[PDB]
Scaffold this motif. Structure first.
Motif, PDB file in Angstrom:
ATOM      1  N   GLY A  45      28.212 -46.973 -11.527  1.00 58.92           N
ATOM      2  CA  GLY A  45      26.593 -47.841 -11.496  1.00 58.92           C
ATOM      3  C   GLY A  45      26.090 -49.092 -11.779  1.00 58.92           C
ATOM      4  O   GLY A  45      25.010 -49.297 -11.984  1.00 58.92           O
ATOM      5  N   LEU A  46      26.742 -50.357 -11.070  1.00 56.36           N
ATOM      6  CA  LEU A  46      26.698 -51.507 -10.810  1.00 56.36           C
ATOM      7  C   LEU A  46      26.580 -51.846  -9.425  1.00 56.36           C
ATOM      8  O   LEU A  46      26.177 -52.666  -9.156  1.00 56.36           O
ATOM      9  CB  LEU A  46      27.928 -52.238 -11.768  1.00 56.36           C
ATOM     10  N   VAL A  47      27.027 -51.269  -8.577  1.00 59.32           N
ATOM     11  CA  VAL A  47      27.006 -51.016  -6.949  1.00 59.32           C
ATOM     12  C   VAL A  47      25.868 -51.321  -6.275  1.00 59.32           C
ATOM     13  O   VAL A  47      25.544 -51.897  -6.100  1.00 59.32           O
ATOM     14  CB  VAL A  47      27.893 -50.554  -6.147  1.00 59.32           C
ATOM     15  N   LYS A  48      24.645 -50.376  -6.480  1.00 60.82           N
ATOM     16  CA  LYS A  48      23.203 -50.913  -6.269  1.00 60.82           C
ATOM     17  C   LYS A  48      22.681 -51.384  -7.164  1.00 60.82           C
ATOM     18  O   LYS A  48      21.981 -52.337  -6.043  1.00 60.82           O
ATOM     19  CB  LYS A  48      22.393 -49.203  -6.485  1.00 60.82           C
ATOM     20  N   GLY A  49      22.881 -51.742  -8.214  1.00 57.89           N
ATOM     21  CA  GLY A  49      22.150 -53.107  -9.026  1.00 57.89           C
ATOM     22  C   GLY A  49      22.341 -54.682  -8.069  1.00 57.89           C
ATOM     23  O   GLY A  49      22.329 -55.657  -7.260  1.00 57.89           O
ATOM     24  N   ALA A  50      23.518 -54.566  -7.984  1.00 56.69           N
ATOM     25  CA  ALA A  50      24.290 -55.839  -6.865  1.00 56.69           C
ATOM     26  C   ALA A  50      23.771 -56.353  -5.157  1.00 56.69           C
ATOM     27  O   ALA A  50      24.041 -56.747  -4.756  1.00 56.69           O
ATOM     28  CB  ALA A  50      26.061 -55.508  -6.758  1.00 56.69           C
ATOM     29  N   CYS A  51      23.567 -54.705  -4.829  1.00 60.17           N
ATOM     30  CA  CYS A  51      23.506 -54.731  -3.839  1.00 60.17           C
ATOM     31  C   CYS A  51      22.020 -55.364  -3.472  1.00 60.17           C
ATOM     32  O   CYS A  51      21.257 -55.775  -2.744  1.00 60.17           O
ATOM     33  CB  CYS A  51      24.248 -53.600  -2.763  1.00 60.17           C
ATOM     34  N   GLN A  52      21.605 -54.712  -4.348  1.00 66.70           N
ATOM     35  CA  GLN A  52      19.413 -55.323  -4.126  1.00 66.70           C
ATOM     36  C   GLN A  52      19.331 -56.881  -4.814  1.00 66.70           C
ATOM     37  O   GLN A  52      18.870 -57.266  -4.647  1.00 66.70           O
ATOM     38  CB  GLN A  52      19.390 -53.751  -4.915  1.00 66.70           C
ATOM     39  N   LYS A  53      20.421 -57.187  -5.957  1.00 63.49           N
ATOM     40  CA  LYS A  53      20.147 -58.649  -6.083  1.00 63.49           C
ATOM     41  C   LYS A  53      20.989 -59.283  -4.480  1.00 63.49           C
ATOM     42  O   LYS A  53      20.213 -60.485  -4.174  1.00 63.49           O
ATOM     43  CB  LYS A  53      21.500 -59.188  -7.165  1.00 63.49           C
ATOM     44  N   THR A  54      21.933 -58.989  -3.413  1.00 68.04           N
ATOM     45  CA  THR A  54      22.260 -59.705  -2.629  1.00 68.04           C
ATOM     46  C   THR A  54      20.766 -59.900  -1.704  1.00 68.04           C
ATOM     47  O   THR A  54      20.753 -60.881  -1.347  1.00 68.04           O
ATOM     48  CB  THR A  54      23.483 -59.380  -1.899  1.00 68.04           C
ATOM     49  N   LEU A  55      20.066 -58.322  -1.496  1.00 67.16           N
ATOM     50  CA  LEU A  55      19.409 -58.175  -0.311  1.00 67.16           C
ATOM     51  C   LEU A  55      18.031 -59.268  -1.341  1.00 67.16           C
ATOM     52  O   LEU A  55      17.242 -59.522  -0.565  1.00 67.16           O
ATOM     53  CB  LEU A  55      18.591 -56.708  -0.394  1.00 67.16           C
ATOM     54  N   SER A  56      17.716 -59.311  -1.962  1.00 70.78           N
ATOM     55  CA  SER A  56      16.507 -59.838  -2.732  1.00 70.78           C
ATOM     56  C   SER A  56      16.811 -61.439  -2.764  1.00 70.78           C
ATOM     57  O   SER A  56      16.238 -62.298  -2.058  1.00 70.78           O
ATOM     58  CB  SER A  56      16.387 -60.073  -4.794  1.00 70.78           C
ATOM     59  N   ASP A  57      18.145 -61.792  -2.839  1.00 72.14           N
ATOM     60  CA  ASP A  57      18.572 -62.938  -2.405  1.00 72.14           C
ATOM     61  C   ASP A  57      17.777 -63.505  -0.971  1.00 72.14           C
ATOM     62  O   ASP A  57      17.923 -65.101  -0.643  1.00 72.14           O
ATOM     63  CB  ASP A  57      19.915 -63.943  -3.177  1.00 72.14           C
ATOM     64  N   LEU A  58      18.944 -62.931  -0.136  1.00 70.33           N
ATOM     65  CA  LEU A  58      19.056 -62.727   1.461  1.00 70.33           C
ATOM     66  C   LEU A  58      17.584 -62.487   2.317  1.00 70.33           C
ATOM     67  O   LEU A  58      17.505 -63.348   2.728  1.00 70.33           O
ATOM     68  CB  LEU A  58      19.531 -62.283   1.054  1.00 70.33           C
ATOM     69  N   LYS A  59      16.107 -62.363   0.676  1.00 65.21           N
ATOM     70  CA  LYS A  59      14.641 -61.934   0.825  1.00 65.21           C
ATOM     71  C   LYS A  59      14.905 -60.658   2.663  1.00 65.21           C
ATOM     72  O   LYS A  59      14.278 -60.515   3.178  1.00 65.21           O
ATOM     73  CB  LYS A  59      14.246 -63.639   1.552  1.00 65.21           C
ATOM     74  N   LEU A  60      16.327 -59.677   2.540  1.00 61.22           N
ATOM     75  CA  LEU A  60      16.301 -58.885   2.916  1.00 61.22           C
ATOM     76  C   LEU A  60      15.759 -57.370   2.630  1.00 61.22           C
ATOM     77  O   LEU A  60      15.642 -57.671   1.265  1.00 61.22           O
ATOM     78  CB  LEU A  60      16.976 -58.963   4.227  1.00 61.22           C
ATOM     79  N   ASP A  61      15.337 -56.323   3.656  1.00 62.51           N
ATOM     80  CA  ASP A  61      15.652 -55.332   3.319  1.00 62.51           C
ATOM     81  C   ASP A  61      16.320 -54.394   3.587  1.00 62.51           C
ATOM     82  O   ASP A  61      16.241 -53.577   3.403  1.00 62.51           O
ATOM     83  CB  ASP A  61      13.586 -54.262   2.930  1.00 62.51           C
ATOM     84  N   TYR A  62      17.040 -54.745   4.061  1.00 63.25           N
ATOM     85  CA  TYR A  62      18.607 -54.600   4.562  1.00 63.25           C
ATOM     86  C   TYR A  62      19.383 -55.547   4.924  1.00 63.25           C
ATOM     87  O   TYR A  62      19.319 -56.530   5.102  1.00 63.25           O
ATOM     88  CB  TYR A  62      18.662 -53.246   5.408  1.00 63.25           C
ATOM     89  N   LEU A  63      21.157 -54.937   4.755  1.00 67.05           N
ATOM     90  CA  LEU A  63      21.933 -55.357   5.181  1.00 67.05           C
ATOM     91  C   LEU A  63      22.643 -54.991   6.626  1.00 67.05           C
ATOM     92  O   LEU A  63      22.545 -53.651   6.635  1.00 67.05           O
ATOM     93  CB  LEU A  63      23.366 -55.703   4.092  1.00 67.05           C
ATOM     94  N   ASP A  64      22.975 -55.639   7.646  1.00 64.30           N
ATOM     95  CA  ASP A  64      24.075 -55.174   8.457  1.00 64.30           C
ATOM     96  C   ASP A  64      24.818 -54.644   8.076  1.00 64.30           C
ATOM     97  O   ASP A  64      25.604 -53.809   8.798  1.00 64.30           O
ATOM     98  CB  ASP A  64      24.091 -56.416   9.437  1.00 64.30           C
ATOM     99  N   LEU A  65      25.636 -55.010   7.463  1.00 64.54           N
ATOM    100  CA  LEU A  65      27.031 -54.564   7.011  1.00 64.54           C
ATOM    101  C   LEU A  65      27.130 -55.479   5.391  1.00 64.54           C
ATOM    102  O   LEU A  65      27.107 -56.473   5.223  1.00 64.54           O
ATOM    103  CB  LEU A  65      27.917 -55.524   8.199  1.00 64.54           C
ATOM    104  N   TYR A  66      27.906 -54.702   4.487  1.00 66.26           N
ATOM    105  CA  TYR A  66      28.228 -54.466   2.567  1.00 66.26           C
ATOM    106  C   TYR A  66      29.381 -54.508   3.050  1.00 66.26           C
ATOM    107  O   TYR A  66      30.156 -53.346   3.217  1.00 66.26           O
ATOM    108  CB  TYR A  66      27.141 -54.086   2.482  1.00 66.26           C
ATOM    109  N   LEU A  67      30.550 -55.420   2.350  1.00 68.47           N
ATOM    110  CA  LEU A  67      31.333 -55.128   1.903  1.00 68.47           C
ATOM    111  C   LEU A  67      32.458 -55.247   0.440  1.00 68.47           C
ATOM    112  O   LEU A  67      31.593 -55.190   0.089  1.00 68.47           O
ATOM    113  CB  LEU A  67      33.231 -56.348   2.804  1.00 68.47           C
ATOM    114  N   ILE A  68      32.836 -54.002   0.186  1.00 67.94           N
ATOM    115  CA  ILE A  68      33.809 -54.663  -0.640  1.00 67.94           C
ATOM    116  C   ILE A  68      34.399 -55.583  -0.354  1.00 67.94           C
ATOM    117  O   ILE A  68      35.339 -55.653   0.347  1.00 67.94           O
ATOM    118  CB  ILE A  68      34.869 -52.936  -1.112  1.00 67.94           C
TER     119      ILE A  68
END
Ligand SMILES: NC(=O)c1ccc[n+]([C@@H]2O[C@H](COP(=O)([O-])OP(=O)(O)OC[C@H]3O[C@@H](n4cnc5c(N)ncnc54)[C@H](OP(=O)(O)O)[C@@H]3O)[C@@H](O)[C@H]2O)c1
Ligand SMILES: O=C(O)COc1cc(F)ccc1C(=O)NCc1cccc([N+](=O)[O-])c1
Length: 316
Positions: A87-110
């Motif tokens: 339940g936390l993964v999507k929000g963590a990804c979305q915070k990173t996307l917001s900070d990086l100014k992006l609407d997708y990442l090319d690669l997201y790693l554990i």
């Protein structure tokens, strides 16, 4: 030496990227701007590095300036250990996307196989100083990563600091939907990683080498530690090729079919580190560099050794 490697999601990844761990927030915007100006097209990021907002400022400016198009960039980030619950993964990804100014990442790693208790602290401690684990395992976290692909937030997913049994666990996951595209691991002449690299490559997983220069700015460095950049044997190979020691250290993983992500905030070094596509190390040079292995880790994780999922007990 082609500039990009084909991933098992069908996308191409630049083999040279810019690292950002320890890049001060007041210097990393310029570092990333310079990197893009001199040809870098891959930036390695993470929420835990606490500088994604400033990395994003640089990316957005260079997109606005039309120095690059978004499709030409390859932006990587990583899910921190306190966000392994589903339940936390999507929000963590979305915070990173917001900070990086992006609407997708090319690669997201554990980022690490070890999950920690959620909360504000990146290393939640018990009163005796041990890190407090999460009870969410690498397979359920992986399923949450797969969802991000299916929601369009990330083009590719992968893992970092996974040992070969942990890689195997995901590859053997019941109902696996997407294989990991990348395993990002420490790798350099003092930690050559032959066993884990061949396993990953044999499964079609691309390996990214981190700390390729031996991380001289790591916060826990001690004077007694070995120093790649000062090793006279490596300096001699560099002199023979009329290159710097850092350039040899960057070219080395490239010739092993690895991706490599040297970090710098110094403009002249950012440019230097990219000038590695115009020379070749011989097979003898490569085997000589491999011979320097001593199983020495920048990122040993000694404060995490009792975690059920600590990665560095196993031989590899
Ligand atoms: N997945 C993981 O768990 C993980 C762990 C560690 C690292 N990483 C990633 O890998 C990246 C690279 O690793 P790292 O930051 O540990 O260390 P590194 O890239 O091995 O070394 C960075 C250090 O080398 C210096 N340097 C850079 N280019 C140089 C050159 N041409 N000549 C001399 N010195 C030079 C930098 O100084 P200046 O910056 O002052 O120029 C900095 O002190 C990280 O930034 C991060 O993105 C990931
Ligand atoms: O993990 C990285 O990318 C580099 O190292 C760090 C960067 C940060 F901003 C903060 C912390 C670290 C760090 O301590 N990283 C090391 C580490 C983390 C988590 C788990 C383990 N483990 O062995 O299981 C090791």
């Amino acid at each position: 030496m082609a500039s990009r490697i084909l991933l098992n999601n069908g996308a191409k990844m630049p083999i040279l990227g810019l690292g950002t761990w320890k890049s001060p927030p007041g210097q990393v915007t310029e570092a990333v701007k310079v990197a893009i100006d001199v040809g870098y097209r891959h930036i390695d990021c993470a929420h835990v590095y606490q500088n994604e907002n400033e990395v994003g400022v640089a990316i957005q400016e260079k997109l606005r300036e039309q120095v690059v198009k978004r499709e030409e960039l390859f932006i990587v980030s990583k899910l921190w250990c306190t966000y392994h619950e589903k339940g936390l993964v999507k929000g963590a990804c979305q915070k990173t996307l917001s900070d990086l100014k992006l609407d997708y990442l090319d690669l997201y790693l554990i980022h690490w196989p070890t999950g920690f208790k959620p909360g504000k602290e990146f290393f939640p401690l018990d009163e005796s100083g041990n890190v407090v684990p999460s009870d969410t395992n690498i397979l359920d976290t992986w399923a949450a990563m797969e969802e991000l692909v299916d929601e369009g937030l990330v083009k590719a997913i992968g893992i970092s600091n996974f040992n070969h049994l942990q890689v195997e666990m995901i590859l053997n996951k019941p109902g696996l939907k997407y294989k990991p595209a990348v395993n990002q691991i420490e790798c350099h002449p003092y930690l050559t990683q032959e066993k884990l690299i061949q396993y990953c490559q044999s499964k079609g997983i691309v390996v990214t080498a981190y700390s390729p220069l031996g991380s001289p700015d790591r916060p826990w460095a001690k004077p007694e530690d070995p120093s790649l950049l000062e090793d006279p044997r490596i300096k001699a190979i560099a002199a023979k090729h009329n290159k710097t020691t850092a350039q040899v250290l960057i070219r080395f993983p490239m010739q092993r079919n690895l991706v490599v992500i040297p970090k710098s905030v110094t403009p002249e070094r950012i440019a230097e580190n990219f000038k590695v596509f115009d020379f070749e190390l011989s097979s003898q040079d490569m085997t000589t560099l491999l011979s320097y292995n001593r199983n020495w880790r920048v990122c040993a994780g000694l404060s995490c050794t009792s975690h059920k999922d600590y990665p560095f007990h196993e031989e590899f």
